[PDB]
């Protein structure tokens, strides 16, 4: 027995140069004599540049290297659900073996333009601001971008939790995070029961750079396996910035020519290849969908850096989180002005569509008037009314942590606000008004909630006015 064999020239910083291996393919998986794996990224005239997927302290000059003639694959199946796995697929939670059968190539073509169908059905996050102003549909790609400690992880956790009813699978990919943080996230998901339909892929900071580079592709392969069977998947990438940092490290250590900010020339190619694989398959292909929620971290709000611009240009919409809003009591800190969603309107039930249009104008008027508050006060009745409406709107679009809201209750509270029923409530009590209104709706207005949940449309405005008036007649103001 014999195979194609090379010999190491150089070892260092997780890169191994090999001499020989005449017939190796580009990207082929390659293993050393120590038993650790590698990947051939550089195919030079007299040598091959190999990226090492494991601990390289055992590799020395002169060790022979062996081909495998295989491309990297990951295990896929229903068994992974509830587990925490390596980017290579091995379990890390210690709960034992993972008994899957099928495997998928890590690099595969995205669905074609002919195979897709237009995005037309919603993804309920349970965040009122997102579901009202920046809608997300199945098959969409939404960027969530902000500085550190703005709530990006919390938004993803809430979105994953809220999918308890909808028959949709969640995948959380942790890139460059600390293992203690990943364990805390796993326990938080377990508490609320999201692990029954979630797969967690983790690539900590202590692992070699190629694993951090490959983790999103393992996540999206596991997603595509379910997508092609007709299911629906929600994939979350936690730091594409950290992934790009790892890829820059590899590119520099392989001595490839650098671009701006020392980034490799094909970082946009990498990210586009990763993100263009979310889609909404046509009913010919089964009707499945896969939506992606990439994260990008910015330094002190610079959205004009290379990676932020690359990711912003690719995705269908962006959600902006800001510390100025976060610490002013406005949390979640979505800047409703900067945030966009191109798919929006086809990802919103008709009841929410009827109210969000007025909500947008109500917010915009207040945002325009706010810039001049320092000079002119009590300018006219129009500005007074606009300011009061905007303040109550801001108070409505505010909710606490790990408390998602069903779409019917969201649309009812938004309708109540936008029709003027809150214009006689002090701005400090709107939160408690919302809580008591939710309790009252649960207790008595079950017919309206059922009508919304069944026909995706608002109830008749006579009955809804009756219900709101009946609640207001008993609400107590302090």
């Amino acid at each position: 027995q014999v195979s194609d064999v090379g010999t190491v020239i150089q070892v260092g910083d997780g890169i191994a140069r090999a001499h020989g291996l005449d017939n190796v393919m580009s990207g082929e998986l390659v293993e050393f004599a120590n038993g650790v794996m590698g990947m051939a990224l550089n195919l030079e005239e007299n040598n091959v540049g190999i990226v090492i997927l494991g601990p390289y302290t055992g590799i020395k000059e002169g060790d022979e290297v062996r081909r495998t003639g295989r491309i990297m694959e990951v295990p896929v199946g229903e068994a992974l659900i509830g587990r925490v796995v390596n980017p290579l697929g091995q379990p890390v939670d210690g709960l034992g073996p993972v008994e899957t059968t099928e495997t998928r190539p890590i690099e595969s073509p995205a669905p074609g333009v002919m195979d897709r169908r237009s995005v037309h059905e919603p993804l309920q996050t349970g965040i009122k601001a997102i579901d009202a102003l920046v809608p997300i549909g199945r098959g969409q790609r939404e960027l969530i971008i902000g500085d550190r400690q703005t709530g990006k992880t919390s938004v993803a956790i809430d979105t994953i939790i809220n999918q308890k009813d909808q028959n949709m699978i969640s995948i959380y990919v942790a890139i460059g995070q600390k293992e203690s943080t990943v364990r805390t996230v796993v326990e938080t998901l377990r508490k609320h029961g999201a692990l029954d339909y979630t797969i967690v892929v983790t690539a900590s900071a202590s692992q070699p750079a190629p694993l951090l580079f490959l983790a999103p592709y393992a996540g999206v392969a596991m997603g595509e396996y379910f997508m092609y069977k007709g299911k629906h998947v929600l994939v979350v990438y936690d730091d594409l910035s950290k992934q790009a940092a790892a890829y820059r490290e590899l590119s520099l250590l392989l001595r490839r020519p650098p671009g701006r900010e020392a980034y490799p020339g094909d970082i946009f190619y990498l990210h586009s290849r990763l993100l263009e694989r979310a889609a909404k398959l046509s009913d010919a292909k089964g009707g499945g969908s896969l939506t992606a929620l990439p994260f990008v971290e910015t330094q002190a709000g610079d959205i004009s850096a290379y990676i932020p611009t690359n990711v912003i240009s690719i995705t269908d919409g962006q959600i902006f989180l800001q510390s100025d809003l976060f610490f002013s009591g406005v949390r979640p800190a979505i800047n409703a002005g900067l945030s966009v969603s191109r798919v929006g309107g086809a990802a919103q039930i008709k009841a929410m569509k009827k109210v969000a249009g007025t909500l947008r104008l109500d917010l915009a008027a207040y945002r325009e008037l706010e810039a001049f508050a320092q000079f002119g006060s009590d300018l006219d009745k129009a500005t007074q009314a606009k300011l009061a409406r905007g303040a109550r709107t801001v108070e409505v679009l505010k909710q606490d942590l790990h408390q998602p809201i069903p779409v019917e209750k969201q649309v009812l509270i938004i309708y109540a606000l936008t029709r003027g029923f809150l214009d006689d409530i002090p701005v400090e009590d709107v939160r408690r008004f919302e809580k008591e209104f939710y309790l009252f709706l649960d207790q008595n207005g079950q017919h309206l909630l059922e009508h919304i949940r069944t026909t995706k449309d608002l109830p008749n405005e006579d009955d809804l006015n009756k219900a709101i008036e009946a609640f207001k007649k008993t609400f107590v103001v302090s």
């Binding site: 195919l43 650098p258 586009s272 001049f372």
Partner: protein
């Protein structure tokens, strides 16, 4: 006979070695076709474009697809010409990739069909034609303040989500309706979702079979993303030069063309220019934009959508595309939020066709007065913001009153806006536009409320809505 040999593979960049004296020329197309020999090999069907001559019989090439599976020592067949794409009446109704291979699943192009090279020199100074004639489009703002020129270049600028793609779709529909010519759409850096939506919209509207579509989707390599635009341009140039028609080019986004250029240059190893762009940005842009001109046999007009990163107009891509255009159009997030589509900024939008001797004295007077009143309203707003409008003089209050009407009348409802609102669209002639704006300014509609003017079409519809509201 000679065949190349793959020497280096460094991602989307490949080196090929040939025999002495039989090297390919720059920009020639090379084909790699390799049925797998054994289980440790993968089939390859790939094409490359020559970029540099490295000496020692070596050629530096850039790939037009994924390079995974390549093995050092494969055989390369030189085709002896640049990339060539089918042209003619065959291309109509079809959807192609960068290489001219159809992707619509409707069939393959016959091998006897004529094909033209992607790369060719621009038309000479001798053969240009320079007469100005206006391109009517049925949009109030365009036909009033920034008229288009048949045979010229038009640029659309704005941030994300403002309406550039929908505006291009509306232009396609309106022009293919009211002129019935031939058009070509080039999706440089196309999003797959948007491409599918556009294709099904074309099928629904029936505009297809009068247009050709080329798509460079984002997950393709930068070589393909850069050559898609030239593929569209040569397909349009066939209809101009050969058949003597008049053609419209619709380019998805030029910012992505420049991004792909910079990425290609960085891969090839050149030193970055200002803010990391390629040194040859101006030359590549000029090579693309010079071939879109009008000559005796026909004219080519092109409408190009531009993305402005973070509202910065000093970025090299917009700053270098500003040199070539005949008309401009700035789309605003601020006007988009107020419910005013197509969200065109009436003050930033400029054109060189807005001259008294070209469009007419009355049109020029009306547009000038509209611009003056709008700018006057803009200035007064900040004075109002600190001092109440009850303090303002009577004439300026009249200016504000009329400016509200003018601003809300500039808005329109579109054909393709049905999928967003349900309200059917409209088409407005230029004479109707100028007369409607001569009124209002005259004072004929001061008693009507401002909310009756939004998304209306012809002026009579304002009165119809006002009657429907009892006012």
């Amino acid at each position: 006979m000679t065949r190349g040999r793959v020497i280096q593979v460094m991602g989307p960049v490949v080196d090929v070695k040939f025999e002495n004296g039989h090297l390919p020329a720059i920009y020639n197309a090379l084909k790699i076709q390799h049925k797998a020999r054994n289980e440790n090999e993968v089939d390859i069907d790939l094409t490359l474009e020559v970029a540099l001559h490295l000496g020692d019989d070596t050629v530096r090439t850039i790939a037009m697809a994924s390079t995974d599976g390549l093995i050092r020592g494969m055989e390369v067949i030189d085709t002896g010409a640049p990339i060539s794409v089918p042209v003619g009446e065959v291309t109509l109704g079809r959807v192609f990739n960068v290489l001219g291979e159809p992707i619509d699943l409707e069939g393959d192009i016959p091998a006897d069909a004529r094909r033209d090279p992607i790369h060719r020199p621009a038309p000479k100074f001798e053969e240009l034609a320079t007469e100005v004639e206006i391109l009517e489009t049925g949009i109030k703002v365009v036909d009033l303040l920034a008229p288009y020129i048949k045979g010229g270049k038009i640029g659309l600028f704005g941030g994300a989500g403002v309406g550039k793609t929908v505006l291009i779709q509306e232009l396609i529909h309106n022009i293919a309706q009211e002129h019935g010519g031939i058009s070509v759409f080039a999706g440089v850096g196309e999003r797959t979702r948007e491409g599918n939506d556009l294709y099904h919209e074309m099928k629904d509207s029936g505009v297809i079979s009068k247009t050709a579509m080329v798509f460079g989707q984002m997950n393709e390599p930068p070589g393909a993303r850069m050559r898609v635009a030239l593929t569209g341009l040569t397909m349009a140039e066939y209809f101009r030069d050969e058949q003597g028609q008049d053609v419209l080019l619709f380019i998805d986004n030029i910012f992505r063309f420049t991004q792909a250029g910079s990425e290609v240059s960085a891969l090839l190893g050149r030193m970055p220019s200002a803010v990391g762009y390629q040194p040859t940005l101006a030359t590549e842009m000029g090579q693309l934009q010079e071939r879109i001109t009008s000559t005796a046999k026909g004219s080519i007009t092109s409408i190009q959508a531009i993305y402005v990163p973070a509202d910065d107009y000093t970025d090299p891509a917009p700053a270098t595309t500003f040199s070539h255009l005949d008309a401009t159009t700035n789309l605003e997030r601020k006007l988009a939020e107020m419910g005013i589509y197509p969200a065109v900024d009436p003050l930033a939008s400029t054109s060189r066709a807005l001259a008294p001797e070209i469009v007419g004295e009355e049109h020029y007077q009306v547009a000038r007065k509209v611009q003056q009143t709008l700018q006057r309203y803009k200035e007064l707003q900040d004075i109002i913001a600190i001092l109440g409008m009850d303090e303002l003089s009577d004439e300026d209050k009249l200016v504000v009153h009329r400016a509200r009407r003018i601003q809300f009348f500039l808005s329109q409802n579109f054909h393709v806006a049905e999928q967003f609102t349900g309200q059917p669209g409209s088409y407005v002639p230029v004479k109707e536009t100028v007369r409607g704006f001569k009124e209002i300014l005259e004072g004929k509609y001061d008693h009507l409320p401002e909310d009756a003017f939004r998304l209306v079409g012809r002026i009579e519809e304002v009165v119809e809505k006002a009657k429907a509201m009892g006012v």
